[PDB]
Design a binder for this molecule. Structure first.
Ligand SMILES: [K+]
Ligand SMILES: [K+]
Ligand SMILES: [Pt+2]
Ligand SMILES: [Pt+2]
Lengths: 392, 388, 392
């Protein structure tokens, strides 16, 4: 009420070394993108407009061409967020009909998003198969009947399983779907655009391009995860299906705003131009082990002067991607600090309440600043923030 | 001259090994079984009265004292237990259960598959990774017969994950007048922290003192006995369960009966070092190194053999404590002429067979699961393979 | 509790002369077998493993080879007990369908096992035909219909009938089944492995090999009866059917334990090796009359010196099989004893309270020891046990 003297949203210095952070706003955007967003929003535009023909035009039009080239899909479409994509794909293709999905992929992502809950709401009929931990091909096949509208796979973005476990290979799903003439729908969630192994990160994570050339009929994902774009629900695949989807009156309630759209176009342009270093989420996961040290030591050089301050620099295995690559472990350089008068728990608590705030990881009352997620300009702001707190 | 079922030297350092026969028994238990099996017995007989008597009666007594439950029963195996609990209490009725507890343990056992064959009507709630208490309460209606919970014995989840506190389930059950059933699976009898192993693993006694109306579990896992389906809890329910005709098809044999009777005695006599599974999991890190270097001593003299001793963290419990990681001393070996993959293959086809881990062409003998008498047989076996 | 300090199951010397004794544990095992059981229990093993392939394997595998060869069936399977086999056979092949069976074969064996009761819990539907005493082929055929799934015969193991009686020849059943294309299931119950007349005991009792070569599609039986092994439900027959059965999820609830599997295998190996004398239940039923006498007078020799003891040796007709051959009447030599101070009712009572206990027959205040079921090592122990009770 009296907090209305200032906006509650503030920039925040991320030292958790966690690149995709559900809590801290997911993917940050490059300055290139943001200016472009800024430019389009400052006045009028050709949002819904064809300057060639002097008539109204589709907004999606702008984007879809990039997506089809980059992923290789026959057509594409973009809605508010992946939650909605999932929703839309189901309500559109499977209303009143059965959707076969593994008992192990019925996930909850975030607080309010639960596959079965949203699937129910869609109008779709959930046919669950296999077991929590193991699901075989026979499980999918067995549930096929006259009323089967769709074979579905969700990628477990936020958690993973270990031990006695089994999963169906996507090849097999497509094979299966082809054989019964049932469409395959893959919610990959991460919105990874192309293979990770190209940037020197070896992982199995599915990307649009590859899962499309594998013959999956529809593939969706979030824009603000491994795409490192703004928030969006990205769908790509068979033209016939996308079309039924674009037609669903619901797809108008899910229609993206001019800010995300513009931001998403530029992000795609960057990809087209192979400018990966210019989209933060990728730059951050691809950063050189030496550059992390270089940064860590650069920070330590700034903090020596501060009183009661114990400063070290460690080398550690961390899990950088939070809402995308949970199994992934990459080495990074954290800068560890300790204070005499204050427990690290109270230091951390004081740092969050600072302006601007700083969020970091703690281990055994040893305070860690993971360099992975820390920008150049933040260094200077960490020093000024620390001496103001400790030297008061 | 070879029978197909043979003693196998376990070097996998995996204590509860679903492949290699789960829990090995103590020579104390074994001889006892041997005695009861060698002639006739009072299996179903009352020597006081000179008439027929109950075969479980004694086992139940043990269990009732050790867990604290009103009554109890014992069937062929926990799959059976699960089948009988559901078939008896939930036929045509709905059983509420977490989408994250619908497990497959082994090749043949799937909660939803057996449950269906049960007659029970599966009402699945929550999500794979996160299930809340609301979820259970929500699926409660006129036809709800059971709030069920299955312990994830053979796999685990990491990351964003949620689960309902057992206490909350009991409260819930008590609130709506619905009985609660817990398939612990591992059949842990008492609290682990007693043997200096700190884990949250649920045990019969605690889960019973918590107010769970029924608890089940295998006899050949963390209880370290012979195969069995153990059920303990409210008397009125067990009564219903004993009365079901199917419980006759599930009736335990004289061997596991005797074996189980002895295993429980040891427990009553707090002799935990005399039940191998517990002894193996509680063994001293020095005793493992001691055992490791003792074996290396015997292997030096064999040709082509590179012998080292390492220190590694292993996950000892296979079908029971999947999260658990304990350190142990593996004796590592390699040969010049033969690849470790080929050497392991030749060890399996030996008499007696030897099963080991492979890590980067380094053959490993994890001492955790290896017995004293096994050392001398390994030597004799290795030299007969290599120098021949 | 106080009675907990010691186990309640104890070895017990059987002088009832009743070989298959429902109360005293049924079939005892030879030491060869027990040793083998002890060996496989003492440590780890190949239970569910393939040492050739270095991966998991079926446990049953080991056994099936033996059963298939011994009985001459295509395929076989082994569950917990014959009750379970019966339950499993029916729940697999006859759920919701009709099973035709003679009104004379609806049996209660044990206290807890009733065909019609378990068949009901089976899901199978009972179509009972004929009458108690007489049943003709006509009855069977006349009840066949669209929902007929199975023709079933249950062997009356624990009772028998005399007088005006009729029964369908197995051959005709098979012939009837082949006619309408209906499978025929025989619950032998006794699980006798080979024809008895080979050992000089002339009886009609059915065995596995003979009932299989007669074209019965499935035959089941107990392991701890006339097979002389540990407890088990043994099914043998047509592969196509065993297959369907093996795949029933319930068959995992009835999966046999490491101990009985071990014991079973050794038992069977003894059969392959044709060492019948090394399986107690066959040895005891085939014992020579002279041998029983020999044994009876060797006992009398030991007891003469005991005070107050009157000892004679008689020759009597007894009924050795309790739960398998109720008709069988065989001559045996009992050793009869009488005391002047103690009533035989009080003397038997004390003998059961001994360590080890001793259970015998009482007839008109005379105490009988039937040599059929008494081992050689038990004689000495009966001497020492008697003098301790009578002298003390
Ligand atoms: K929006
Ligand atoms: K058993
Ligand atoms: Pt008592
Ligand atoms: Pt006592």
């Amino acid at each position: 009420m009296k907090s209305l003297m200032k906006p509650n949203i503030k920039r925040v210095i991320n030292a958790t070394g966690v690149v995709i952070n559900t809590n801290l706003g997911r993917a940050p955007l490059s300055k290139d993108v943001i200016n472009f967003i800024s430019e389009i929003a400052n006045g009028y535009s050709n949002l819904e407009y064809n300057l060639e023909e002097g008539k109204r035009g589709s907004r999606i039009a702008h984007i879809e061409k990039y997506l089809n080239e980059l992923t290789g899909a026959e057509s594409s479409f973009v809605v508010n967020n992946n939650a909605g994509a999932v929703f839309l794909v189901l309500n559109t293709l499977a209303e009143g009909k059965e959707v076969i999905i593994s008992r192990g992929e019925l996930v909850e992502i975030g607080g309010s998003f639960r596959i079965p809950d949203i699937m129910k709401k869609s109008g779709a009929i959930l046919r669950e198969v296999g077991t929590t931990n193991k699901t075989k091909v026979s499980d999918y096949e067995g549930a096929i009947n006259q009323n089967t509208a769709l074979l579905m796979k969700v990628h477990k973005s936020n958690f993973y399983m270990e031990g006695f476990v089994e999963e169906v290979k996507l090849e097999d799903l497509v094979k299966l779907g082809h054989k019964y003439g049932i469409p395959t729908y893959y919610d990959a969630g991460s919105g990874l655009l192309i293979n990770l192994k190209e940037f020197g990160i070896s992982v199995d994570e599915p990307n649009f391009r590859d899962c499309i050339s594998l013959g999956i009929d529809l593939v969706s994902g979030s824009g603000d995860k491994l795409l490192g774009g703004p928030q969006a629900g990205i769908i790509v695949g068979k033209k016939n299906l996308i079309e039924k989807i674009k037609k669903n009156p619901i797809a108008r309630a899910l229609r993206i705003d001019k800010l995300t759209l513009s931001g998403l176009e530029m992000t795609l342009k960057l990809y087209f131009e192979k400018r990966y270093e210019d989209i933060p989420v990728i730059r951050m996961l691809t950063q050189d082990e030496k550059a992390l040290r270089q940064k860590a030591k650069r920070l330590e050089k700034l903090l020596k002067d501060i009183p009661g301050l114990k400063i070290s620099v460690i080398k550690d295995k961390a899990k950088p991607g939070g809402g995308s690559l949970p199994e992934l472990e990459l080495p990074t350089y954290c800068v560890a600090i300790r204070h005499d008068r204050l427990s690290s728990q109270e230091l951390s608590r004081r740092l969050r309440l600072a302006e601007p705030p700083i969020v970091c990881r703690i281990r055994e009352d040893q305070l860690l600043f993971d360099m992975r997620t820390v920008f150049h300009e933040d260094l200077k702001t960490i020093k000024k923030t620390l001496q103001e707190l400790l030297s008061i």
